[PDB]
């Protein structure tokens, strides 16, 4: 069942005495005319404790998991044995409970409804326990939740909170809050400003136009021998590395110094496409720092290589029945390169 | 009652740095509660225990807020916290999903997931244990030796801890300077009819000044009124006529 929290839920925010003044403060409070939850003791569920509860009824236990692992806080004489602390101490008995920045607040009022009542802090406890649920320990009561609302307080000559204003409920309350009084006169008053927010983002670019001619490089009919390896300049074009990356037709795709799948966004001065053919088992020798006949006399990568290496089998194009004798490789030399 | 002079003039502390409150004056002022946090870390990393510093410690282990009000003490302990065979009883967290909020402690030891494949709670490739050992030794360099650190956090309500300064007696209807739990000022101490609630402590003016005080020793409500002041005027005829004056 739902009931409206008409005007109750205000409390003294500090221990500072002010009288016959109007004070504006921002803190956590129970918003006016809020739907409360109703439970009856005619035949104790789990109730979350996200920020605070205005529990008014006409023991207690506050746990987080409640599996005898992260032991909770018990109130009868207060014993909090997570032990970590202990303490010994018609009728509308309203109470307020909240926890903020390692500080536990308890408020009370015992009166024998649309009325005003202010609660003073009792048994405040600065421990710092993590609490997320709420269970009563033992007839109808009510449960509500509080929100970060800005309130305008009224103090009388004796320093008792007798009136309050919810500065975010309705435009009349907004005008009262901005005029710092509980009565206003005729006229138009400025209250706040509105700003329409952006909906979605838009990014645009021109068309792709010319592409880099990877097709003719990779797809050509003839490759030169290793010892006379070719070379090409490629520039002034947009290159899609993703298409060649996600082809799954490449036996070996190793990258050095630069991670794949992110090449798509890095602008470079130049590229180079060195191509040749070597023995299949020997492909592992082409690496930045290896040694061997091929790596020492035919193609040596520097220690600071920055790029990727591609290779695949082509046994069914470059092999002839009579034996291909058009591929050569150096075997002797005076010194490495 | 806390006496900080014995700490300060000890000369056995390598570092004694104070933010917000200066030493040599701690034992004068009163404040609500302290908090002493203690732990042991490597010698080099001491500079990370300070507001606004970033790194492994100040990100995954122990983070101080930006409005810190306290003091930091540290001193080398190379002859207590090291062992011949290497001390592996001191650990520190290395990987975490996101940084820490101030004064928040983490204790769990679940396996970090550093890659795409979920680890399902077993360690392996790209599934690292999140804790590592310092490995202190008596022969390590001074940059790699154990240091003990104690952080004091003050919170500047009825104060309960402060210095050993003695109290004196109160006077009435006399322009004097007072000291109530560190609150200083000048005024005349007159009786007040204000009805403070039992938990009510002070009274504040519009200009954020104290108007009434509740004595700590004997619970009684006094009234503060600023001492007399004003301007002076000199009434003078022309000097060409006389030199007599009358002040106002």
């Amino acid at each position, epitope marked *: 069942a739902y009931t409206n929290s008409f005007t109750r839920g205000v409390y003294y925010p500090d221990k500072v005495f002010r009288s016959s003044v109007l004070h504006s403060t921002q803190d956590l409070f129970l918003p006016f005319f809020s739907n409360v939850t109703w439970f009856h003791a005619i035949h104790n569920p789990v109730l979350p404790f996200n920020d605070g509860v205005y529990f008014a009824s006409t023991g207690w236990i506050f746990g987080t998991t409640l599996d005898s692992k992260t032991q909770s806080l018990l109130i009868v004489v207060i014993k909090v044995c997570e032990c970590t602390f202990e303490y010994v101490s018609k009728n509308l008995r309203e109470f307020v409970f909240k926890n903020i920045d390692g500080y536990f607040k308890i408020y009370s009022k015992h009166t024998p409804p649309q009325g005003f009542s202010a609660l003073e802090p009792l048994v405040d406890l600065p421990i710092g326990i993590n609490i997320t649920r709420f269970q009563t320990l033992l007839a109808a009561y009510y449960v509500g939740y509080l929100q970060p609302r800005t309130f305008l307080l009224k103090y009388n000559e004796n320093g008792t909170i007798t009136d309050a204003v919810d500065c975010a409920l309705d435009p009349l309350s907004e005008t009262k809050c901005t005029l710092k009084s509980f009565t206003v006169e005729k006229g138009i008053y400025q209250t706040s400003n509105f700003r329409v927010q952006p909906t979605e983002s838009i990014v645009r670019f021109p068309n792709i136009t010319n592409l880099c001619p990877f097709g003719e490089v990779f797809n050509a009919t003839r490759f030169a021998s290793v010892y006379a390896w070719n070379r090409k300049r490629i520039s002034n074009c947009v290159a899609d590395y993703s298409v060649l990356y996600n082809s799954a037709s490449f036996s070996t795709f190793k990258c050095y110094g630069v991670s794949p799948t992110k090449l798509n966004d890095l602008c470079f001065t130049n590229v180079y496409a060195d191509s040749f053919v070597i023995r299949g088992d020997e492909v592992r020798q082409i690496a930045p720092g290896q040694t061997g006949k091929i790596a020492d006399y035919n193609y040596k990568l520097p*220690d600071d290589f920055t790029g990727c290496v591609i290779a695949w089998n082509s046994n069914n194009l470059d092999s002839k029945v009579g034996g291909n004798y058009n591929y050569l490789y150096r075997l002797f030399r005076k010194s490495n390169l | 009652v806390a006496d900080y002079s014995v700490l300060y003039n000890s000369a056995s502390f390598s570092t004694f740095k104070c933010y917000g409150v200066s030493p040599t004056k701690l034992n004068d002022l009163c404040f609500t509660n302290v908090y002493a946090d203690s732990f042991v870390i490597r010698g080099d990393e001491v500079r990370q225990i300070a507001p606004g510093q970033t790194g492994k410690i100040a990100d995954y282990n122990y983070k101080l807020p930006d409005d810190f009000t306290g003091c930091v003490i540290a001193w080398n302990s190379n002859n207590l916290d090291s062992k011949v065979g290497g001390n592996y009883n001191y650990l520190y967290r290395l990987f975490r999903k996101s940084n820490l909020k101030p004064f928040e402690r983490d204790i769990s030891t679940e396996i970090y997931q550093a890659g795409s494949t979920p680890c399902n709670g077993v360690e392996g490739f790209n599934c690292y244990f999140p804790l590592q050992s310092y490995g202190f030794q008596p022969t390590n*360099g001074v940059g790699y030796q154990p240091y003990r650190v104690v952080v004091l956090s003050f919170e500047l309500a009825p104060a309960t801890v402060c210095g050993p300064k003695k109290s004196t007696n109160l006077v009435k209807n006399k322009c004097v300077n007072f000291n109530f739990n560190g609150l200083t000022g000048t005024g005349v101490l007159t009786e007040s009819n204000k009805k403070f609630l039992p938990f009510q402590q002070f009274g504040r003016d519009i200009a954020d000044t104290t108007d009434a005080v509740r004595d700590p020793q004997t619970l009684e409500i006094l009234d503060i009124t600023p001492c007399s002041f004003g301007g002076v005027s000199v009434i003078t005829p022309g000097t060409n006529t006389s030199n007599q004056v009358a002040v106002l």
Partner: single-chain antibody
Amino acid sequence: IVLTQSPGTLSLSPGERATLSCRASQSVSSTFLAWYQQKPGQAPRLLIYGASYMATGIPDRFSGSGSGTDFTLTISRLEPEDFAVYYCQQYGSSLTFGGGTKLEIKSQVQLQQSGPGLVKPSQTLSLTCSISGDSVSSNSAAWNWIRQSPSRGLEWLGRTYYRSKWYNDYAGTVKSRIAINPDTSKNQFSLHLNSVTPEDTAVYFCARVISVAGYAFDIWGQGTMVTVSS
């Protein structure tokens, strides 16, 4: 990930400094670089883990630094007994060693190895590494197998360990024909290779790794050689 030993070979005299280098193929986010020193005829020894932290019973001459994709080890004052070889190892998404640098000048836990040293080709190879001073089913440890051949250097074969049940990993080259079995009853773990080839001739070690010590090979074994021949 591939580690490249940057300086090739150095020769110095007693007294002055020495500077090494190690370069990574790409970033090591785990940051578990280590440095080993091996005298001839002996098992390697650990020097540094985490790239900065000293090992057990190591003088202060040794200091390491680096991060990201480069690292370096420095010797402050040479001593004419430090003619040895120095390696460079990492851990993370893959476990790979380094080439190593030649340098020349001018104990509560023990592992014991046993098994045949000669095998008829195309047969089974079996070794055993006994443990004295610890329990093979420890929660915070793992047991590996490392072999060394001059043509291939130092290579990682496989490992086993136990958290709640038993878990195994193996290197890609050797997946199809390798298996490791522990024996808690007599506190030993063994290595089996069903089939052998001539190139497998090498020297094998058994090692221990502690997860809280930077995943560094703390304790090694005596090591034995296996030759594949007629």
